[PDB]
Design a protein around this ligand. Sequence first.
Ligand code: 1XS
Ligand code: 1XS
Length: 123
Amino acid sequence: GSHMVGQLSRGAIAAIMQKGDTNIKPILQVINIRPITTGNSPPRYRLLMSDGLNTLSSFMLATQLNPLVEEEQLSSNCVCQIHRFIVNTLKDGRRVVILMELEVLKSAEAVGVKIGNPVPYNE
Ligand SMILES: O=C(O)c1ccc(-c2ccc(F)c(Cl)c2)o1
Ligand SMILES: O=C(O)c1ccc(-c2ccc(F)c(Cl)c2)o1
C-alpha cells in the first residue's frame, strides 16, 4: 500500500480541535493506548492518535468500546475510522475527545509501523 500517509485523514486533528468539526468521520492511526487511573469504575483508556500530520493524546474511549482493547484488535499501529465522537472541555480548559463509535480498518499486524512522521498538536 504505497503512500501510507495517504491512508490517514491529514488535518483532522486540527479540524477537531480548532473548528470542533464533528460532521467528519476521520481515519486515524492508534499510536499508543494506556489505562487511566480510575477508582472502582470500569477502566478508561486514553489514546495517542495520529492523523499523519499531528498526534494528539487527548482521546478517550467511551467505556462501551472497552472490549475492542481488551478482547479484539484495538492496539498500537492499527488504523481506525471514527464514526462518532464528542469533544468535552474540562473546567481547566483542556479538551478531551471521546470516541463513541469506531471501526478498525486495518489491524495493527497489517500496518505494523507508525505512518509518516506526525508531530504533537499544541493545545
Ligand atoms: O493517567 C493518565 O494518563 C491521565 C489521568 C488523567 C488524564 C487527563 C486529564 C485531562 C486531560 F485533558 C487529559 Cl488529555 C488527560 O490523563
Ligand atoms: O460513554 C462514556 O464512557 C463517556 C461519555 C463522556 C465521557 C467523558 C467525559 C469527560 C472526560 F474527561 C472523560 Cl475521560 C470521559 O465518557
